Design a protein around this ligand. Structure first.
Ligand SMILES: *[C@@H]1O[C@H](CO)[C@@H](O[C@@H]2O[C@H](CO)[C@@H](O)[C@H](O)[C@H]2NC(C)=O)[C@H](O)[C@H]1NC(C)=O
Ligand SMILES: *[C@@H]1O[C@H](CO)[C@@H](O[C@@H]2O[C@H](CO)[C@@H](O)[C@H](O)[C@H]2NC(C)=O)[C@H](O)[C@H]1NC(C)=O
Ligand SMILES: CC(=O)N[C@@H]1[C@@H](O)[C@H](O)[C@@H](CO)O[C@H]1O
Ligand SMILES: *[C@@H]1O[C@H](CO)[C@@H](O)[C@H](O)[C@H]1NC(C)=O
Ligand SMILES: [Ca+2]
Length: 429
């Protein structure tokens, strides 16, 4: 995934549970009929059949909308008899991009219905598009067939055709197809966790029943062949392939998954984060317009840290060039970039600094080593490991009397008046 990228588009309906308030034949078996019209608007002979939820070959559950839209016999969900207020809802186990919807009614399309989304797993909902035979009379909204931008539409509400009639909504409206698809403005429109259809009123086939040997009956019910929800895994443009989301058990389908295989040194379920060691500059979504990747930059830690965090104060201090700060410096290092050895250690020039043994422990003798005020312990020079010795004490470790001194002790070494080479133990010449 070199440049800005995106996973494959697909029907989010597949593999997931579509829910509906009701379905025909909930209790016992039920006779049901369908009525459509021909060119002369005369009612056709109604195909009738039995419905029963307990049996697969008679049931019409909501899941019949999420199945393949091209199988041997067409399948459809069918609500209980005599119901107007109905709701179809699709809950997603993660955040996905929703681009455009296609419903396909077997019965006549509803005289009124609305579509909306939840961006926060069902806590809140916000409209997408209203549908009615008259937007002004039903919802007090303008019709987009005239207003060219309205939120309501009668384009998909005509009783004819009484069967196979489709309802459609496209999130990628003229304003949203241009510009960067990952911008804040577009995410507001595309990103969703749920998708809900609320049917408000049924619609009877207004065809002429002249050729009918019997009056219409057992038809007051909703019916939908397919609930095609085109969309894709959301990854902020830092991925082109997704795996299953943790804890998700799907139900002959081509399922769309949500867990992003993140690229561009990003991380998180949707690449919203930077990789743990790549917080040197602020995260940013890939630019679909520009095609720019906007990939996370690594922190400099000299190989003494595997994690780091951004810092706006350090960021501005560098001149907006770098702001990473290494977390939990390993190998006895200390710096912001783990670039120095801690006190009580020093640079081992024999080794490279990136090496684990870059810093070597100090061997300052506790008694022979002098201590500075406002400190209770001696630490060696980090550059060469030389400890500051008390008077008369010598060496890099201050662990023995200087030449010409004796009586190693907590106050250094006494000068031997030989003078003359000393025996450091007794002071004899
Ligand atoms: C939608 O609005 C109404 C309801 O169907 C209808 O418009 C009526 O008739 C004329 C046509 O423009 C309007 O001036 C009246 O105010 C409406 N009367 C009522 C009682 O609503 C028409 O069916 C539709 N078309 C529109 C409004 O253009
Ligand atoms: C990089 O941009 C500027 C420095 O050139 C940083 O300061 C920002 O300045 C802009 C105006 O140019 C303001 O709108 C921002 O509010 C400033 N940021 C802050 C944190 O005060 C800016 O911070 C840097 N980039 C980022 C992402 O912080
Ligand atoms: C067999 C059956 O479905 N019985 C239901 C019952 O479970 C429910 O509590 C009641 C509420 O109206 O309606 C009836
Ligand atoms: C099934 O019967 C019960 C009454 O005991 C009640 O739920 C209703 O009449 C039937 N169910 C539906 C969904 O209509
Ligand atoms: Ca179907």
């Amino acid at each position: 995934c070199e440049k800005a990228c995106n996973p494959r588009m697909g029907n989010l309906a597949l593999g997931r549970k579509l829910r509906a308030d009701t379905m025909c034949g909930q209790n016992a078996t039920e006779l049901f009929c369908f009525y459509s019209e021909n060119a002369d608007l005369t009612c056709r002979q109604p195909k009738c059949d039995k419905c029963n939820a307990a049996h697969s070959h008679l049931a019409h559950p909501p899941s019949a909308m999420a199945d393949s839209s091209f199988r041997f016999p067409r399948t459809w969900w069918q609500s209980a008899e005599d119901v107007h207020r109905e709701k179809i809802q699709l809950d997603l186990e993660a955040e996905f991009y929703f681009t455009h919807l296609i419903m396909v009614f077997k019965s006549p399309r509803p005289a009124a219905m609305v579509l909306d989304r939840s961006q926060d797993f069902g806590k809140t909902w916000k409209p997408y598009k209203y549908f009615a035979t008259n937007c002004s009379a039903t919802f007090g909204l303008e019709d987009d067939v005239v207003k060219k931008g309205a939120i309501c539409t009668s384009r998909y509400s005509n009783p004819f055709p009484c069967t196979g009639g489709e309802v459609i909504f496209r999130a990628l409206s003229p304003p949203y197809d241009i510009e960067n698809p990952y911008s804040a403005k577009v995410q507001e429109q595309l990103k969703i966790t749920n998708l809900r259809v609320r049917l408000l009123k049924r619609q009877s086939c207004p065809c002429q029943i002249n050729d009918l040997n019997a009056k219409p009956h057992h038809f007051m019910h909703y019916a939908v062949y397919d609930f095609i929800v085109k969309g894709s895994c959301f990854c902020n443009g830092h991925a082109d392939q997704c795996l299953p989301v943790e804890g998700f058990r799907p139900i002959a389908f081509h399922v769309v998954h949500g867990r992003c295989m993140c690229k561009h040194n990003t991380a998180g379920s949707h690449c919203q984060h930077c990789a743990p060691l790549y917080n040197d500059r602020p995260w940013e979504a890939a630019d679909g317009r520009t095609g720019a990747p906007n990939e996370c930059r690594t922190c400099k830690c000299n190989g003494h840290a595997d994690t780091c965090h951004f810092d706006v104060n350090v960021w501005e201090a560098s001149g907006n060039r770098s702001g990473g700060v290494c977390n939990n410096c390993q190998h006895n290092t200390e710096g912001q970039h783990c670039q120095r050895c801690k006190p009580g250690f020093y640079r081992d020039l024999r080794r490279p600094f990136s090496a684990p043994d870059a810093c070597k422990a100090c061997s300052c003798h506790p008694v022979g080593s002098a201590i500075l005020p406002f400190s209770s312990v001696t630490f060696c020079d980090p550059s060469n490991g030389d400890c500051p010795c008390k008077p008369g004490v010598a060496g890099p470790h201050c662990d023995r009397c200087m030449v010409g001194y004796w009586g190693f002790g907590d106050y250094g070494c006494r000068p031997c008046d030989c003078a003359g080479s000393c025996d450091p133990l007794t002071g004899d010449c």
